[PDB]
Amino acid sequence: PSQTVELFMMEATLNDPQWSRMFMSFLKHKDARPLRDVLAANPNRFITLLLRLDLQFQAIKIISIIVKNDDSWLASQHSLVSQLRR
């Protein structure tokens, strides 16, 4: 998962709507426990990418997929809530 996330989250790939749509199909698969874990452990890229509207929307979309199946999480006071508040 380490090499794949760095290639699929690149801005040049995220600009094309077809590439983004195909990626979301992969991320919604139920057998991605070893794949979605690395996304939740790397919030640095999200901060630099969340803060051009379509790219922000894709940042908005990716959050739901990692939260809709991982509700028992995010009980701290980290900056992700602060950026979403802004």
Coil vs helix vs strand at 58: helix
Residue 86 CB contacts under 8 Å (≥ 6 apart), including other chains: none
- Which of 58, 62, 60 shows the shortest CA–CA distance to 15? 58
**Residue 49 — φ and ψ, nearest 5°?**
-105, -30
Q: How was this structure determined?
A: cryo-EM
At position 45, the amino acid (one-letter code) is R
